[PDB]
Write a protein that binds this ligand. Structure first.
Ligand SMILES: [Mg+2]
Ligand SMILES: [Mg+2]
Ligand SMILES: [Mg+2]
Ligand SMILES: [Mg+2]
Ligand SMILES: [Mg+2]
Ligand SMILES: [Mg+2]
Ligand SMILES: [Mg+2]
Ligand SMILES: [Mg+2]
Ligand SMILES: [Mg+2]
Ligand SMILES: [Mg+2]
Ligand SMILES: [Mg+2]
Ligand SMILES: [Mg+2]
Ligand SMILES: [Mg+2]
Ligand SMILES: [Mg+2]
Ligand SMILES: [Mg+2]
Ligand SMILES: [Mg+2]
Ligand SMILES: [Mg+2]
Ligand SMILES: [Mg+2]
Ligand SMILES: [Mg+2]
Ligand SMILES: [Mg+2]
Ligand SMILES: [Mg+2]
Ligand SMILES: [Mg+2]
Ligand SMILES: [Mg+2]
Ligand SMILES: [Mg+2]
Ligand SMILES: [Mg+2]
Ligand SMILES: [Mg+2]
Ligand SMILES: [Mg+2]
Ligand SMILES: [Mg+2]
Ligand SMILES: [Mg+2]
Ligand SMILES: [Mg+2]
Ligand SMILES: [Mg+2]
Ligand SMILES: [Mg+2]
Ligand SMILES: [Mg+2]
Ligand SMILES: [Mg+2]
Ligand SMILES: [Mg+2]
Ligand SMILES: [Mg+2]
Ligand SMILES: [Mg+2]
Ligand SMILES: [Mg+2]
Ligand SMILES: [Mg+2]
Ligand SMILES: [Mg+2]
Ligand SMILES: [Mg+2]
Ligand SMILES: [Mg+2]
Ligand SMILES: [Mg+2]
Ligand SMILES: [Mg+2]
Ligand SMILES: [Mg+2]
Ligand SMILES: [Mg+2]
Ligand SMILES: [Mg+2]
Ligand SMILES: [Mg+2]
Ligand SMILES: [Mg+2]
Ligand SMILES: [Mg+2]
Ligand SMILES: [Mg+2]
Ligand SMILES: [Mg+2]
Ligand SMILES: [Mg+2]
Ligand SMILES: [Mg+2]
Ligand SMILES: [Mg+2]
Ligand SMILES: [Mg+2]
Ligand SMILES: [Mg+2]
Ligand SMILES: [Mg+2]
Ligand SMILES: [Mg+2]
Ligand SMILES: [Mg+2]
Ligand SMILES: [Mg+2]
Ligand SMILES: [Mg+2]
Ligand SMILES: [Mg+2]
Ligand SMILES: [Mg+2]
Ligand SMILES: [Mg+2]
Ligand SMILES: [Mg+2]
Ligand SMILES: [Mg+2]
Ligand SMILES: [Mg+2]
Ligand SMILES: [Mg+2]
Ligand SMILES: [Mg+2]
Ligand SMILES: [Mg+2]
Ligand SMILES: [Mg+2]
Ligand SMILES: [Mg+2]
Ligand SMILES: [Mg+2]
Ligand SMILES: [Mg+2]
Ligand SMILES: [Mg+2]
Ligand SMILES: [Mg+2]
Ligand SMILES: [Mg+2]
Ligand SMILES: [Mg+2]
Ligand SMILES: [Mg+2]
Ligand SMILES: [Mg+2]
Ligand SMILES: [Mg+2]
Ligand SMILES: [Mg+2]
Ligand SMILES: [Mg+2]
Ligand SMILES: [Mg+2]
Ligand SMILES: [Mg+2]
Ligand SMILES: [Mg+2]
Ligand SMILES: [Mg+2]
Ligand SMILES: [Mg+2]
Ligand SMILES: [Mg+2]
Ligand SMILES: [Mg+2]
Ligand SMILES: [Mg+2]
Ligand SMILES: [Mg+2]
Ligand SMILES: [Mg+2]
Ligand SMILES: [Mg+2]
Ligand SMILES: [Mg+2]
Ligand SMILES: [Mg+2]
Ligand SMILES: [Mg+2]
Ligand SMILES: [Mg+2]
Ligand SMILES: [Mg+2]
Ligand SMILES: [Mg+2]
Ligand SMILES: [Mg+2]
Ligand SMILES: [Mg+2]
Ligand SMILES: [Mg+2]
Ligand SMILES: [Mg+2]
Ligand SMILES: [Mg+2]
Ligand SMILES: [Mg+2]
Ligand SMILES: [Mg+2]
Ligand SMILES: [Mg+2]
Ligand SMILES: [Mg+2]
Ligand SMILES: [Mg+2]
Ligand SMILES: [Mg+2]
Ligand SMILES: [Mg+2]
Ligand SMILES: [Mg+2]
Ligand SMILES: [Mg+2]
Ligand SMILES: [Mg+2]
Ligand SMILES: [Mg+2]
Ligand SMILES: [Mg+2]
Ligand SMILES: [Mg+2]
Ligand SMILES: [Mg+2]
Ligand SMILES: [Mg+2]
Ligand SMILES: [Mg+2]
Ligand SMILES: [Mg+2]
Ligand SMILES: [Mg+2]
Ligand SMILES: [Mg+2]
Ligand SMILES: [Mg+2]
Ligand SMILES: [Mg+2]
Ligand SMILES: [Mg+2]
Ligand SMILES: [Mg+2]
Ligand SMILES: [Mg+2]
Ligand SMILES: [Mg+2]
Ligand SMILES: [Mg+2]
Ligand SMILES: [Mg+2]
Ligand SMILES: [Mg+2]
Ligand SMILES: [Mg+2]
Ligand SMILES: [Mg+2]
Ligand SMILES: [Mg+2]
Lengths: 67, 96
RNA sequence: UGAAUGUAUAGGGGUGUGGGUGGUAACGCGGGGAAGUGAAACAUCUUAGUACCCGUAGGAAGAGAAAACAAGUGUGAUUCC
RNA sequence: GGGGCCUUGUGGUUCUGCUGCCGCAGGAUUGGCCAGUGAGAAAUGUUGCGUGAAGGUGAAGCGUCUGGGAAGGCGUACCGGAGUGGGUGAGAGUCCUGUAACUGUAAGCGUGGCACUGGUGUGGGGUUGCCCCGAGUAGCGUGGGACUCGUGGAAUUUCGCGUGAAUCUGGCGGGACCACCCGUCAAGCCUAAAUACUCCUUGGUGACCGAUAGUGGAUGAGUACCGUGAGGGAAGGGUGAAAAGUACCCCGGGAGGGGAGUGAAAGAGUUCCUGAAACCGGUCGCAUGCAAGCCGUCAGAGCCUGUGUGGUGAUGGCGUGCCUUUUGAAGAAUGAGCCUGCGAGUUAGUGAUGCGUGGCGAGGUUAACCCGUGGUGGGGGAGUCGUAGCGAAAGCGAGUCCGAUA
RNA sequence: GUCCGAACCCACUUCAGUUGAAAAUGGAGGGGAUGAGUUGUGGAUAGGGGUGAAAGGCCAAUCAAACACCGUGAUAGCUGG
RNA sequence: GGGCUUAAGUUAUCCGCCGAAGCUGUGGCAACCUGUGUGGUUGGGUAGGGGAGCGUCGUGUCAGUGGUGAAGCUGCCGGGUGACUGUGUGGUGGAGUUGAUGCGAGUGAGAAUGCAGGCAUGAGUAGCGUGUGACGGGUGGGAAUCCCGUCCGCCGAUUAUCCAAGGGUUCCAGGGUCAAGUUUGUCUGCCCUGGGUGAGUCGGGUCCUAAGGCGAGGCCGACAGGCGUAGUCGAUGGGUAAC
RNA sequence: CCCUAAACCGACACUGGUGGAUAGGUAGAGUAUACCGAGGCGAUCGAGUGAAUCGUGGUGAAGGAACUCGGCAAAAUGCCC
RNA sequence: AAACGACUGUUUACCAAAAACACAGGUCCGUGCGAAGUCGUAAGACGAUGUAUACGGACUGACUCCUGCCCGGUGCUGGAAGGUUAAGGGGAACUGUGAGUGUAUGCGUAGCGGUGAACUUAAGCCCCAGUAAACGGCGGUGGUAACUAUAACCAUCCUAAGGUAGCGAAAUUCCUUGUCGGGUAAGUUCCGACCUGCACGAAUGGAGUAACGAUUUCCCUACUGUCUCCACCAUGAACUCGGUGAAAUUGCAUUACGAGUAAAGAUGCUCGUUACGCGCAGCAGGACGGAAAGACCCCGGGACCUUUACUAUAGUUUGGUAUUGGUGAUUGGGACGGUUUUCUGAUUGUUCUGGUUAUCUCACUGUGGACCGUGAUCCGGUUCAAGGACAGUGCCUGAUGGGUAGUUUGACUGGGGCGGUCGCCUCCUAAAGGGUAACGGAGGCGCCCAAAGGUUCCCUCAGCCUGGUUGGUAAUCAGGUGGUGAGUGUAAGUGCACAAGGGGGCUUGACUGUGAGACUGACAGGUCGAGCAGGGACGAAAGUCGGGACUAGUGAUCUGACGGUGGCUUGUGGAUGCGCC
């Protein structure tokens, strides 16, 4: 049986060309009025995942290339 | 993750959408065209590159990393502006 | 032959004219349809249309000859891999 | 599209009707392009092959030696389209059964197929005046279900309840919906093969089991037995080549034994091949009745033996089991009466991700499937991974995105 | 639905039994003993159900949901190996 | 602890010694690093990681080997650093199997209140299931326990006699003493062989119905099925001829 | 053929359960109890032995509940006129 | 003599026989007969071949005397003035596409669609009554009688009403062995009272009660081995001999004692003491003896029970619609032309349609009679009677629904429970970097401010002393002194007098695109930030400004929403939906 990928992982993490695992920065979906432009800018890009989290993501992905 | 909200649920979903009709190009660069067609390669068609390596039955956009001292006439699907400029300056052309 | 009753019918009386009844390990088709379990609780969800049950076949069954796909040129019943 | 209206064409007819004494049709041994036992708007005999069920033929070795026995050793000959197996007193190509090869098949309800008999039977161009083209159907609403789709932007499909068409200048579909375009013609039906399975029958196979295994079942096995019942459910294989299965005598009521016989072997005697351990004892050597012992270990006299190595071992020192689980167990925490047997990290993915190793290499590799009825070999490149990335994407591309061609 | 008291039905106390004579009894007494009595034969009610002068009692010697088989090799962040 | 002040007690000082698997000496083994002819450093270990091997079974190939005796079992004499092992040497046994190199595992057990079998410990111990037997003779290899007899005792609203239900041959006769019988047994409800049960009237059917069951048609119910009429069964009852 | 059982239900040749019928004498109200009848049994390990101790019965000076949670157990009473 | 139950009975097979259950008697509620109720999907059936003196459910429980106050809550019964309220009916309006029109933008006819629905519309709920032998409830403060204690009594607060009769140290009384009396030599028990009823009380009945009870309790007498205080006798075992022959258990074994030590209670370890080998009968101190993977406690899981936990659902109920039809009125919404005057004001006929209501009857009712199938209490057909477009049933729809089902019901914790706590900020513990725990010790936060933000410029306070109208310690003025003790929006700490504290002017940087480089967390994440561009504020400039002297004032993801943009759109164009910010 083919082993399926994780759907949330499919939707949440990208894998770059060199193999890095990147996610969208968390904390900017709402409640943004009190957040400054500096805080919003800090939460506005992409984050390269740490070693253990990246290994967990590549395990959850079934050879899926991310999104 | 032991009960803590896991990584695949604390991270926001990458949104966006997928183009249902997107078609990828099999890209070839001018260094490859120079290496595989060195001897004044007159006309290079998709059949020729697919004979070397372009993975046939696909579109064959030609890109422009490399110098391309030789003169070539590439009839292919699509090209980059830099590749076209380099090809024309070398003395050749592109078509299709 | 034809009740109540009128047409008639229900019913009644002769003939065996043909078929049926029951069984069957798996496979088929149509229908009814769990829970444990997983979700580290649980109710949507899963298990699973599974287990079981009902009706009913055949040597296979079901489907099948476009009120179809496709996307601008085209393919041309179904089934199975 | 068909009907209707016509321009025409039926296989050569003996000659009967209706329409206009035009023409159309029933009609007939005799062609026939066809077409047949089929789904095909259908279903009735005599002749033509090879087979499964049974059979038939089926090659070719003797001499010596040892042994109970020769298939074994030694010597020397044959057959092979046959040396796959299995039996025979031990290990057989030539002893048997067979095997390869051919062969027969009366018979089948035989079965397949062919020939004849017998059975049934054509259209092409024009026209849209007119006529037909599947109705409580399709849609719609509502409550449910199947679709990747869990009610949604909900197409398609289906069940209950309501409501309810058009009909060719028409209906349906192309993911709400509309317009155009494309495709298609629902509400009638029948259709082989490729696919699934094995209670059964025939032949064969196995880096499958070998009596606690393999079926629950190698035997009176779904039996004994248990249960009111549904139901549950065992254990027990092996003498020997051949019963030649121990005549006869002795002790004994017998059982059993002792002589003897058979046998190669009886300590192979039916509780029968081999015959382990626990456990139970007879005999011999040493030690042992002043001694406190996780039972051993080191030091060590003496005795026996000496098969100059081995048995036992007075006495001295040191020394609180095994496992599990715990901060910590000799623990008075758990488990274990003992022995024998059995009892737990496996297998499947053209899964994920590493490593070793081999092949090929900017390329690598096939899947299903086809051929080899001779297999592990060959084809098959459909797909797939690599070959360029960045972006939500359009896209651009050694760049790309946020950005103002910053 | 009187009284005393055998058979019969029961089971209050005590002793024994407790690897029993017995998976509930024996000895000695004790209650009812014409009644809402007791008993033979056959029959009816069946599991979220039966039946219950009501104790969650009984439903084939363990019933706050029988037994058998099946889902099933249920699951166990627990114990053991 | 004995014992110790006549210190073997406290204290200061001095001189010796004992004392570990520590260190040194000597003889082996092993891991890593290092110049690559010195050698140096290192080698307790649970969970755990890594590396390399022993033994069992099947199997391709090669070389074989076995009644002049394979496997398995059991001794003795040896060997390796370990799992282990000899191509040493017997005994038993009676038909297979050895070495090299690969291939595949149902490949190793001490424990799971593990499963099956066999056998210990308790232990020649507890018990031998209410009770009254005694003697004379017989049978027999064997007699408290069998047979016969005489005394005596016991039940007698039952320790008697006869049925139903249930069981199923246990009944009788003869032969038997492996097993069963809580002991023995010559005996038996046990074993083996043979035999034994006779109905017009007795109990059932052939007659009748109760409760209840089933139920032509039928009615009800998606299916499965539920109920029920006409009927047909169904004794524990009615009827029916012998003492 | 067994049948208030050694043959049935209890795993047993089990001090338990099991429906019906016949059921005599003397004493007695009696089918209680005692001893007998019809008839059937001596019971399916025995033989001994004055141990403690346990079970089952018996008797008991003086006292008479002082026992004990509690008069538990036993004794006393008991029948007819 | 007391308690309980009236009595006879029944019950936890196998630890409870009772005071529990039942009972005869009582009351309430339901039921008009296809009864209600119950089993069943239904038909049927029981109820009952009964008929309100009957049947079913509930509670109480002979008999006697009685059974008090409260209808606020909840339930039940009735009612309907208003409010709210489903499906359905039905508007108005909006809107997609679209022939064409438009120099193009755009608009938009017909046709085919989409959206929600002003008005109308039931039960239920709110609401108003009744009902307690319905489920239930039946109080507080202050004080007063001629010893004192209490309160008949008074005032009050509040409630729906505030416990009546009777009983009371009780099967109820904590304190408690209450107090007093009786019984005994001595009585935590007893029985008679008292009333101070922690926390009796009138059909979950109150108080009594003859008779009854293997019920519970106390006393007297008789009687006794129950005892003082045991002794003796016989028996079945035990014991010996012959026969037969288990079991539980078992890591071992050549298995002493004392004081210690050790997983804190040692046959097994230490130091000592004692002890010849082996049996037989006995006893039970130990082997933390055996037996049973403790049943108490906690933790994880389950089961069953409850309810105003959640979510469902059978049943019950509401309306709409189908079955479902004929014939009249009486009231509103229209089209329609033509009295009025498209109209503030009114209309008749002529067609379409809501509501209210009234009759008819080969729809239907499984029904009462008769007849037929048939010589059958089933069933069916015909017919009469009785209803009747109702009911029943199907679908949709609101309400009700522990009758049933599936589940949830946190953790920390000096066991668990109760109480407390759970995120963030400041200080101490914290051992002079950072970090560091306890249910350790102190406090704060879940904001606020359009200025209390930005910039520029200016100023210095609190306290003290002296002089001065109201005026005093302290309003306001003047002189001296005073360096931080004042202040800081807000806890605390670190800071700030160069002020970051006080004031004046102008302002919106409380920006848009960014972020070299760093600090801090396992991570999600939190924090600081130079320089640059655009467009601004202040300043003469230097420059400063991406909120606030600093550090709390906050919430990932999913899902959905609004604004902008227009990247995608399943044949094309729209639409629609999605995407991005
Ligand atoms: Mg957003
Ligand atoms: Mg913002
Ligand atoms: Mg959480
Ligand atoms: Mg389901
Ligand atoms: Mg579920
Ligand atoms: Mg779960
Ligand atoms: Mg779980
Ligand atoms: Mg067939
Ligand atoms: Mg078919
Ligand atoms: Mg031959
Ligand atoms: Mg020979
Ligand atoms: Mg779905
Ligand atoms: Mg649809
Ligand atoms: Mg459609
Ligand atoms: Mg489309
Ligand atoms: Mg058609
Ligand atoms: Mg078909
Ligand atoms: Mg086949
Ligand atoms: Mg065996
Ligand atoms: Mg077997
Ligand atoms: Mg064997
Ligand atoms: Mg049986
Ligand atoms: Mg002989
Ligand atoms: Mg031998
Ligand atoms: Mg043997
Ligand atoms: Mg000695
Ligand atoms: Mg000692
Ligand atoms: Mg540990
Ligand atoms: Mg501990
Ligand atoms: Mg132990
Ligand atoms: Mg021990
Ligand atoms: Mg444990
Ligand atoms: Mg044990
Ligand atoms: Mg390709
Ligand atoms: Mg009486
Ligand atoms: Mg009486
Ligand atoms: Mg009873
Ligand atoms: Mg029955
Ligand atoms: Mg209870
Ligand atoms: Mg039972
Ligand atoms: Mg239970
Ligand atoms: Mg259950
Ligand atoms: Mg399952
Ligand atoms: Mg050393
Ligand atoms: Mg080591
Ligand atoms: Mg290890
Ligand atoms: Mg040889
Ligand atoms: Mg072997
Ligand atoms: Mg080998
Ligand atoms: Mg194994
Ligand atoms: Mg073993
Ligand atoms: Mg074991
Ligand atoms: Mg023994
Ligand atoms: Mg003895
Ligand atoms: Mg003993
Ligand atoms: Mg003894
Ligand atoms: Mg004895
Ligand atoms: Mg005699
Ligand atoms: Mg007598
Ligand atoms: Mg018989
Ligand atoms: Mg016989
Ligand atoms: Mg027999
Ligand atoms: Mg006999
Ligand atoms: Mg005999
Ligand atoms: Mg015997
Ligand atoms: Mg005999
Ligand atoms: Mg009858
Ligand atoms: Mg029928
Ligand atoms: Mg009969
Ligand atoms: Mg009879
Ligand atoms: Mg008996
Ligand atoms: Mg008898
Ligand atoms: Mg028996
Ligand atoms: Mg009886
Ligand atoms: Mg008598
Ligand atoms: Mg008597
Ligand atoms: Mg007699
Ligand atoms: Mg007798
Ligand atoms: Mg006896
Ligand atoms: Mg005897
Ligand atoms: Mg006996
Ligand atoms: Mg005397
Ligand atoms: Mg006396
Ligand atoms: Mg006296
Ligand atoms: Mg006296
Ligand atoms: Mg006393
Ligand atoms: Mg007294
Ligand atoms: Mg006393
Ligand atoms: Mg007494
Ligand atoms: Mg007495
Ligand atoms: Mg009292
Ligand atoms: Mg009283
Ligand atoms: Mg009573
Ligand atoms: Mg009574
Ligand atoms: Mg009991
Ligand atoms: Mg009792
Ligand atoms: Mg009554
Ligand atoms: Mg009713
Ligand atoms: Mg009735
Ligand atoms: Mg009531
Ligand atoms: Mg009561
Ligand atoms: Mg009362
Ligand atoms: Mg209303
Ligand atoms: Mg009133
Ligand atoms: Mg008290
Ligand atoms: Mg008192
Ligand atoms: Mg007193
Ligand atoms: Mg009252
Ligand atoms: Mg009360
Ligand atoms: Mg009351
Ligand atoms: Mg009284
Ligand atoms: Mg003896
Ligand atoms: Mg200690
Ligand atoms: Mg000690
Ligand atoms: Mg020792
Ligand atoms: Mg002893
Ligand atoms: Mg004892
Ligand atoms: Mg114990
Ligand atoms: Mg436990
Ligand atoms: Mg629960
Ligand atoms: Mg209605
Ligand atoms: Mg009428
Ligand atoms: Mg519930
Ligand atoms: Mg569940
Ligand atoms: Mg807790
Ligand atoms: Mg605590
Ligand atoms: Mg510090
Ligand atoms: Mg420090
Ligand atoms: Mg810490
Ligand atoms: Mg702001
Ligand atoms: Mg940076
Ligand atoms: Mg912070
Ligand atoms: Mg600027
Ligand atoms: Mg400020
Ligand atoms: Mg979520
Ligand atoms: Mg498409
Ligand atoms: Mg932005």
């Amino acid at each position: 049986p083919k082993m399926k990928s994780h759907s949330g992982t499919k939707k949440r993490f990208k894998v770059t060309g060199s193999g890095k695992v990147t996610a969208r920065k968390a904390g900017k979906r709402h409640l943004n009025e009190h957040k400054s432009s500096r805080v919003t800018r800090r939460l506005t890009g992409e984050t390269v995942l740490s070693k253990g989290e990246a290994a967990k993501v590549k395990k959850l992905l079934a050879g899926h290339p991310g999104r | 993750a032991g009960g803590q909200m896991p990584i695949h649920m604390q991270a926001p979903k990458l949104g966006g959408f997928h183009n249902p009709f997107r078609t990828e190009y099999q890209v070839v660069n001018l260094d490859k065209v120079e290496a595989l067609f060195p001897k004044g390669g007159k006309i290079t068609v998709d059949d020729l590159v697919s004979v070397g390596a372009v993975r046939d039955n696909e579109l064959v956009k030609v890109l422009g990393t490399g110098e391309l001292t030789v003169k070539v006439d590439l009839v292919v699907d699509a090209w980059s502006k830099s590749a076209q400029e380099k090809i024309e300056k070398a003395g050749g052309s592109v078509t299709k």
